[PDB]
Amino acid sequence: ANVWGVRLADSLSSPTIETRTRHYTLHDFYSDLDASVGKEPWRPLRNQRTNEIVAVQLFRPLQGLVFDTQLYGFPGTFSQWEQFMKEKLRVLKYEVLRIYPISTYNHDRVNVFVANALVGAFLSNQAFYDLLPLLIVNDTMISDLLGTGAALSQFFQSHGEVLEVAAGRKYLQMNNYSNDDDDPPLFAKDLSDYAKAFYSDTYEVLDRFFWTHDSSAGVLVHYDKPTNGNHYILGTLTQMVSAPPHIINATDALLLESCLEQFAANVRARSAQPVTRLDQCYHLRWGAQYVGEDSLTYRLGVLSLLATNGYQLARPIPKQLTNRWLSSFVSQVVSDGINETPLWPQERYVQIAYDSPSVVDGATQYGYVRRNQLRLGMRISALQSLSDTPAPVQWLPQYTIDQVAVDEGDAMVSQLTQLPLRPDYGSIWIGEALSYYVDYNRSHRVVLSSELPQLPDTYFDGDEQYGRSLFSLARKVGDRSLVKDTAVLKHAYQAIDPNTGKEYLRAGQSVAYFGASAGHSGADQPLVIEPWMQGKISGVPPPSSVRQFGYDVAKGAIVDLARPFPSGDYQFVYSDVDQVVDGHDDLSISSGLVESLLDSCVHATAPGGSFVMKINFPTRTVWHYIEQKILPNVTSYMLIKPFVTNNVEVFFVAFGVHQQSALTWTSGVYFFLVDHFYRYETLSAISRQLPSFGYVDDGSSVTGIEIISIENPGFSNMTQAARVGISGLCANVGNARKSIAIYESHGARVLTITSRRSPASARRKARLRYLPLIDPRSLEVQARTILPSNPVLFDNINGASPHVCLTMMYNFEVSSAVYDGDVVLDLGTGPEAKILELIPSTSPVTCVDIRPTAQPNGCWNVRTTFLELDYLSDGWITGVRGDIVTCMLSLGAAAAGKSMTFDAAFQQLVRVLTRSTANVLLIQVNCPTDVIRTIKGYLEIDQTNKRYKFPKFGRDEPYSDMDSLERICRAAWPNCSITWVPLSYDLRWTKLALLESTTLSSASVRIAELMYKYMPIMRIDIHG
Amino acid sequence: VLSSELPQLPDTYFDGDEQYGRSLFSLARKVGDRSLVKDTAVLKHAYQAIDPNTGKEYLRAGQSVAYFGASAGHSGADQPLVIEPWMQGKISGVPPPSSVRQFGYDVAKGAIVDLARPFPSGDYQFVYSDVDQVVDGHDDLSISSGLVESLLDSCVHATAPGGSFVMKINFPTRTVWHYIEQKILPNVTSYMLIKPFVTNNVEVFFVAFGVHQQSALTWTSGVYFFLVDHFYRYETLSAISRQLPSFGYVDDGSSVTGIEIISIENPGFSNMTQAARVGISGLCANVGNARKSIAIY
Amino acid sequence: TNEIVAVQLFRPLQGLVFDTQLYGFPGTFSQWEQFMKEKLRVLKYEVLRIYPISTYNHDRVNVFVANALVGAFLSNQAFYDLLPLLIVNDTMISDLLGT
Amino acid sequence: FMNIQLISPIDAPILRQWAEIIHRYWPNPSQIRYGTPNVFGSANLFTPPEVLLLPIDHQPANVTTPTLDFTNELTNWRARVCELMKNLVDNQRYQPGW
Ligand SMILES: C[S@@+](CC[C@H](N)C(=O)[O-])C[C@H]1O[C@@H](n2cnc3c(N)ncnc32)[C@H](O)[C@@H]1O
Ligand SMILES: C[S@@+](CC[C@H](N)C(=O)[O-])C[C@H]1O[C@@H](n2cnc3c(N)ncnc32)[C@H](O)[C@@H]1O
């Protein structure tokens, strides 16, 4: 590297091959004075925002615009200006072709000075005719200027073998230019006289002139291939204004333009395109004994020396320059940190590197000196830039072998903390409700009212209300009542009653509705009435007439539904009003409203029909009353619970009212209700731990996000402090997903490391003593601009895949089965073993896989072990011992790799586990439990050839069944006791998915259940 | 055949004149996307024949492939340009895959990973390298060979065995050929080496088949004749490109090849002078009965 | 009509205590917001001249000095004496007491 | 006056353009090469020898018969000052009385 602002050299390039240039012909003079469409002496420049022409660039046929544009009088639009220039060049064209014939002067030379001053005197109307016959040059180039035809000091004056000219107006400002930073810069090249040029023969005569001439403002040379012979540049005190912070004079403007041109040429050098000049920089000659150290001209002289040497910048320069980027470059160059290169500018001669790729010292002779004593440890090849993307991209770390303290990582992340900012929340739960239903069976069992579990007594807590409000606010739906009513009708029209052989209900039942909210932003009724009348549910029969009741209707009447108001009796009624709003926050008044509302609903049912109840708060009186009253007088019933909100409500459905029947509650209903209250308790304990909806994160909670911000100067090997910071965030994050972004933050290129913390990451971070450190190379290679995004709490939007769901299932049952202080063994650990995140922090591992992993070896509190030995073999468990076997997904993987069956693989594995010392074990087998279903797009079946063929993973393996597994297991161990685990229908596993901040998309978890019943596991003790 | 018998890159490879010729060729040559052309050629040659184990073919539809070294800059569709047409089956000689992952430290959708050092990830039935050994290297044949070593080792250990992979090799050396013959050729079922050609270079595309099955299997003389003729045609076309002038030059009649024009004026239907007749006939003797065009204005 | 008849502003500017004649804002919301954009752009360039972002990446400020700075810049009332009091010292109010 | 950007264009117009005139043109330095260094030692100290800094611009004698032109620096300056004053009387919001 960083000279004052950083540059990315790493090698250095230069244009090697060179175009030798042609010279003037008068045929070419007429050709480019005729402003053709293909070529013309001007070229427009435009804005980068509007693409409107705000400046023009002109060249060789005209340079003599040194007079004032008030004297010239050009218009303001580019089209009128270019046709004006066309017709004035046409008039002067006719004049000069009058005075010179093309036939005799077909191929004779000219003074370019006389040509430019001729077109300038013609545009300024300043009596060009004395200048006219000096057009065709004599034997030499400059003696016609020394022996003057007419002395014209307004254009050029002589000084005794030294010619002074006033080169002006390389560019020309159009009036729509308004010093915008997105507008292109001008480098003070549009003023009257930005500098003066001293054309003469030899540098010795020119320096003998400079003995007497002033050299206050510095003098600039070109030294490579001058425009019209060897000369100098004498800038004046006119300054550049178009950079808003910085005000630079003329000489700094010219040197900055030339050095940026050399920076452009150093990138485009591809060893095949010869350019028009070998180098570009100017090399200040006599001002070094005038101005001194730590001046802007001196610093740009240093940069021009490095540019002539052939260095390349850090930031990729634009093709079209802007005042914004130019001022940013000037702010970077006047910053700090004086030098790291061994190079310094000189006045005696110019210097190029000993290993420079430029050949300009051998190309032209005078002025260019090769140096031998100065050497560079850098490379030779070119450099390329990477293609920027507007989206944030993922990154994955790789661990080295060194380690520092986790307290050092804490100190560095406290230094680099950018925690207090509000993230975007998202949604924890998308999709639809879940079918949780049970029917009444007559010959099933019998239970009593007092046996039923209830709501927990810690229901009205502020923390419970906090969790349920967090869940109901995080969850994303359309209309919840729409979802609930569609679910309850699709479960209501399923089975048949024992009296009639046909079905439950038919088409045209003349139904009634209770408790209409009637506010749904349009269609002022519940949103199922019109699609259910049209039959859009496609699993129901359409009714005949619909009446909506309740004290919030729009079309019906408003009636207190608790007190019995008699109305017309209908074959089917549907209650939807709660007992909370009509209640006054008491379980007693809630139960009493259930009593009265159910009594009115029974007495208004048109007997032989059915009704549906919803119950928010069931109590002993509620269950005992409905068992003593309704269950005798009903034919059949139904109780279901679709689930979009964390609540204790269920949907009770009756069938065949007012017929007596010996009928009580059953143990299947009991198991359903036990599991319902249990999954309520588990999901409430999940929602109690999660932070709120609209909070700000500060690294205080165990779950949440974390970001830090560092800046990277060039491709420099960055410091150990930032390395400890990034590796400490890696140890904080625990091998989860992370995204980065690279962008110029407000004048400096910044780096962001965006990911999320978890309690499993916390136990991982507490597991290891020292944190390992990472490879900086994977971050230091990137040179593209990764545009950032807002911080979101949830990366995933569409929902977790069912394979992520089964991985979460498996991780949960392994973490539940493992205990604290235990040696384990993981068969098929995968790329990164999640068993490090599952087990407690004090229990060691003996884990091994065929896949070579990159886990941090060493610097642990309790020891780890990582190796590869082709685990389906013997001899090694006699070496290393364990207590409990965890073989997840490696059975089918090894069987598909070795093309062998599950029977042979399992008997070999149970043989080498008879070699083992473990008493308990649990492995991932692939056994069908239910009748196979050939799940669409995830799991199809195969009867004969006995395969599965996952199409999502593109994977395939056989399956073995539980009786053959029992045969092999009892042939191995005559003492073992096997327990097949049931499927996690109580949703205990859901905390490990929620605390990792990932939504679920409940169709995926339905497919996950239907899949987990096709590859379960078991628990086998060696005793029993 | 044996490893030591193979001819190699010429030792005059890093010349400025060789870089001049290869840059002249790669700048004069006209394409759409070169990586598109190379990947279409390597897939059309990859899905041809059958392996000796299974009677059916090499690979099938829905292989859940992975990709390495995505440049992701192609003026739109920020990924290599074969992913969408190959997923749609627009090549019409391939089977369409099921899932595509792109890796490499210049991706847009995947993750950026040092591919030389082994980072373990999900194992896929087919992976495709396209990462060079130049950008990650530091202009040395030793570090080029070592990157070939490490990248091929990671590609072998992340192959989901029973599958296949494709390697590209810019700088093969004695260590490279000897290592792959002692290591991979035993543990592979079959292989393939092709070279589509749009640029004057020494790189080849090595394709494997049936990884992690032992086999007595070495190099053969047909591969030897292919490699001899490959290096020989590289040498001939480099000697061709070394003589041609540059891209953006001006001609002055100095080179042996190039253009020539002259300009004369013709007053009426006059029998013009002997001087212009000698000039036109001298340009005829200079041009040697090739095509020529005139203009009158 | 859903036409913009009033605006609400907050934390980066509060020092509009002077008279709107002295300020001179236009009547349409679009011209007013581009006018505010370009004046904040000019003062943005000025304050980024006088303070670098690299050294002052994460240092504090007086919100009072910030609001009075943008107010004195909009009212053209010689803000430059108020300018170097931007980055605050150890406490919040002692810089205001010792003026 | 140092940074012209601080002056608002549409809400300080005459000050803005007068500052633009001042930064755009005002007299420039120059030099004349007087004296001899041979017999007379160089009496200057800070400049190089026998040079004479002049606060306005010169161009030497085109001809020895002088006649009028307006294409010079001070008539240029007077013309721009009169252009400002014409613009100032042109803008009606300043004086409504004349
Ligand atoms: C939330 S709703 C059901 C709304 C609509 N069915 C739905 O599911 O979207 C229950 C309604 O019952 C009403 N309600 C409560 N107690 C009642 C009572 N004793 N008699 C009549 N209506 C009552 C409430 O006003 C409330 O609008
Ligand atoms: C030029 S490319 C191949 C381009 C690719 N075929 C495409 O279609 O865009 C090689 C890529 O691999 C990357 N690369 C080089 N060495 C690497 C390594 N050791 N690990 C990962 N990526 C690497 C380079 O950054 C480069 O983007």
Q: What is the DSSP letter of B250?
A: -
Beta strands A704-711 and A748-757: pairing type? Answer: antiparallel
Half-sphere exposure of A666 (CA within 13 A, CB side): 17
**3-class secondary-structure state, position A198:** strand
Q: How far from each other are the two terminal CA atoms of chain C, in whole angstroms? A: 49
**A949: which residues sit within 8 A by CB, 6+ positions away?**
A940, A942, A955, A956
User: Is C53–A746 a contact, with Cβ atoms under 8 angstroms apart?
Assistant: yes
Interface of A with D in 204-223 (CB under 8 A): 211-215
B116 CB within 6 A, ligand 2: yes
Which residues make Cβ contacts (< 8 Å) with residue A286, sequence separation at least 6? Answer: A210, A215, A218, A219, A347
Judge whether B153 is annotated as a binding position. Answer: no
Q: Which residue has the tokens 């009756």?
A: A654
Q: Residue A816 CB: number of other CB atoms within 10 A?
A: 13
For A214, A350, A434, C54, the CA distances from C51, given in Å and listed in that order, are 38, 37, 59, 9
List all residues 6 or more positions away from A186 whose beta carbon is below 8 Å from its beta carbon: A55, A171, A173, A177, A240, A242
Q: Which residue has the tokens 């409430």?
A: A684
Helix (H, G, I), strand (E, B) or coil at C42: helix
User: In whole angstroms, what is the distance from residue B15 CA to residue A615 CA?
Assistant: 87
Q: How far apart are CA A1012 and CA A602, in angstroms?
A: 42
Neighbours of A890 (CB within 10 A): 24
Dig out the tokens for A65 from the structure: 């615009």
Whether the CB of A335 is below 8 Å from some CB of chain C: the reply is yes
Bridge partners, B208 (sequence order):
B191
Three-state DSSP class for residue A727 = helix
CA–CA separation, A952 vs A936, rounded Å? Answer: 11
Do A467 and A684 contact (CB within 8 A), yes or no?
A: yes
Q: B246 and chain A: CB distance < 8 Å anywhere?
A: yes
- Alpha carbon distance A860, A636 (integer Å): 63
Q: Which ligand is nearest to the CA of A549?
A: 1
Among A508, A512, A517, residue whose Cα is nearest residue A567: A512
Between CA A153 and CA A668 the distance in angstroms is 113
How far apart CA A994 and CA A1007 sit, in angstroms, is 18
What does the block give as tokens for A237?
């005190």
Burial class (CB in 10 A: 0-12, 13-18, 19+), A845: buried
A300, A303, A591 from A371: Cα distances, Å: 21, 18, 100
CB contact at 8 A, A38 and A53: no
- Answer yes or no: do A214 and D3 touch at CB < 8 A: no
What's the CA gap between A613 and B279, in Å, rounded? 111
Residue C29, token pair as written in the block: 């919301």
What is residue A148's three-state secondary structure? coil
Taking residue B98's Cβ as centre, other Cβ atoms within 10 Å add up to: 16
How determined?
Answer: cryo-EM
CA gyration radius for chain C? Answer: 15
Q: How far apart are CA A799 and CA A428, in angstroms?
A: 9
Q: Phi, psi (5° rounding) for residue A234?
A: -115, 95
Q: Which of B106, B144, B153 to mutate to test the pocket of ligand 2 (most atoms within 8 A of CB)?
A: B106
Kindly tell me whether chain B and chain C come into contact, counting contact as 3+ Cβ pairs under 8 Å.
Answer: no
d(CA A432, CA A1003): 7
Residue D78: exposed, middle, or buried by beta-carbon count in 10 A (0-12, 13-18, 19+)?
exposed
Among protein residues, the one whose CA lies closest to atom 21 of ligand 1: A561
Q: Which amino acid is at A923?
A: I
Q: Are A834 and A813 in contact (CB under 8 A)?
A: no
Helices (H) and strands (E) in chain B, counts: 7, 7
Q: Is D27 on the interface with A (CB under 8 A)?
A: no
Among residues A389, A253, A256, A242, the alpha carbon closest in space to that of A322 is found at A242
CA distance A875 to A858: 25
Say if residues A702 and A762 touch (Cβ distance below 8 Å): yes
Token pair listed for A98: 């009058």
Phi and psi dihedrals of B90, rounded to 5? -80, -5
Across the beta sheet with B164-169, the strand order is: B100-103, B65-68, B126-128, B164-169, B204-211, B188-194
User: Using an 8 Å Cβ cutoff, are A537 and A531 in contact?
Assistant: yes
Alpha carbon separation from A600 to A566, A587, A956, D80 (Å, rounded): 8, 20, 59, 98
**Is the alpha carbon torsion for B75, A260, D6, C75 positive or negative?**
positive
Element (H, E) at D67: none
**Subunit contact D48:A151, Cβ cutoff 8 A:** no
B116 is in an annotated binding site: yes
- Residue A282, classed as helix, strand or coil, is coil
Instruction: Transcribe B119-170 into DSSP letters.
Output: ------SEEE----SSSSS-S-HHHHHHHHHHHHHHHHHTS-SS-EEEEEES
Give the H or E element holding residue B70: none
Q: Which long-range contacts (CB under 8 A, 24 or more apart) does B230-235 make?
A: B230/B195, B230/B204, B231/B7, B231/B8, B231/B9, B231/B10, B231/B202, B234/B200, B234/B201, B234/B202, B235/B10
CA angle A884, A887, A893 (to 5 degrees): 165
Dihedral of CA atoms A658, A663, A667, A670 in degrees, nearest 10, equals 30
- Listed resolution, Å: 3.4
3-state secondary structure of B52: coil
Per CB-CB distance under 8 Å, the chain C contacts of A747 are 48, 52-54
Contacts of C46 in chain D (CB under 8 A): 3, 6
Pull the structure tokens for residue A362.
């051998």
Dist CA A548 CA A559 (whole Å): 11
Task: List Cα–Cα distances, B94 to A225, B41, B44, B53, B127, in angstroms.
Answer: 58, 11, 7, 21, 16
Contact A64, A121 (CB under 8 A): yes
Q: Within an 8 Å CB–CB cutoff, is residue A36 touching chain B?
A: no
Determine which helix (DSSP H) or strand (DSSP E) holds A115, and give its type and residue range: helix A112-124
Q: Which of D30, A937, A275 is nearest to B247 (CA)?
A: A275
Give the residue from B45, B6, B49 showing the smallest Cα distance to B202. B6
Dist. CA A306–CA A299, nearest whole Å = 11
Let me know how long chain C is.
99
Local structure of A680: helix, strand or coil: helix
Three-state SS for A218? coil
Beta bridge partners of A351: A369
- B and D interact (at least 3 Cβ pairs within 8 A): no
Residue A377 and residue A342 in contact, taking contact as beta carbons nearer than 8 Å: no
**Count of beta carbons in the 10 Å neighbourhood of residue C2:** 4
Amino acid identity of residue D58, one-letter, is H
Q: Categorise residue A805: left if φ over 0, alpha if ψ from -120 to 50, beta otherwise.
A: alpha
CA B139 to each of CA A117, A118, A410, A497, B171: distance values in angstroms, whole numbers, following the listed order = 53, 55, 39, 84, 11
User: By the 8 A CB rule, do A602 and A657 touch?
Assistant: yes
CA distance A1014 to A787: 44
Q: Which residues pair with A421 in a beta bridge?
A: A697
**A152 three-class SS:** strand
Neighbours of A670 (CB within 10 A): 17
Protein residues with CB under 6 Å of any ligand 1 atom: A 481, 515-517, 526, 550-552, 560-562, 576-578, 581-582
Nearest to A250 by CA among A241, A239, A258: A239
Name the residue among A391, A385, A533, A504 with its Cα closest to residue A439: A504
Residues A210, A219 contacting (CB under 8 angstroms): yes
Whole-number Å distance between alpha carbons of A753 and A751: 7
Nearest to D11 among C24, C45, C46 (CB): C24
CB A325 within 8 A of CB A372: no
Among residues 135-174 of chain A, which lie with CB inside 8 Å of chain D? 151-154, 157
Instruction: Please list, in sequence order, all residues whose beta carbon lies within 8 angstroms of the beta carbon of residue A665, skipping any fewer than 6 positions away.
Output: A446, A447, A448, A449, A452, A623, A627, A631
Q: State the alpha helices, DSSP H only, in A213-369.
A: 250-268, 296-309, 323-333, 360-363
C-alpha distances in Å from residue A794, one per residue of A737, A987, A998:
11, 21, 6
| Cα A295 from Cα A292, distance rounded (Å) | 6
> At residue A745, what is the residue type?
S
State the helix-helix crossing angle for A112-124 and A78-99, rounded to 10 degrees.
120
Q: Which of C58, C50, C54, C46 is nearest to C84 (CA)?
A: C50
B114 vs A379, A393, A778: nearest CB: A778
Alpha-helix residue ranges (DSSP H) falling in chain B: 16-28, 34-46, 83-88, 141-157, 174-187, 221-243, 274-287
* Ligand 2 atom having least distance to the Cα of B81: 8
**A238, A251 contact by CB (below 8 A):** no
Q: Which of C49, C53, C54 sits opposite A245 (nearest CB)?
A: C49
Helix (H/G/I), strand (E/B), else coil: A67: coil
Q: Which two tokens stand for residue A546?
A: 């619909």
Neighbours of chain B (3+ CB pairs under 8 A): A
| DSSP reduced 3-state for D70 | coil
* Residue A545: how many other CB atoms lie within 10 Å: 11
DSSP assignments along A875-944, one per residue: SSTTTS--SEEEE-SHHHHHHHHHT--HHHHHHHHHHHHHSS--SEEEEB-----S----BTTTB---SS
* Contact between residue B47 and residue B65 where contact means Cβ atoms under 8 Å apart: no
Which conformational region is residue A229 in: left (phi greater than 0), alpha (psi within -120 to 50 degrees), or beta? left
Radius of gyration of chain D (CA): 21
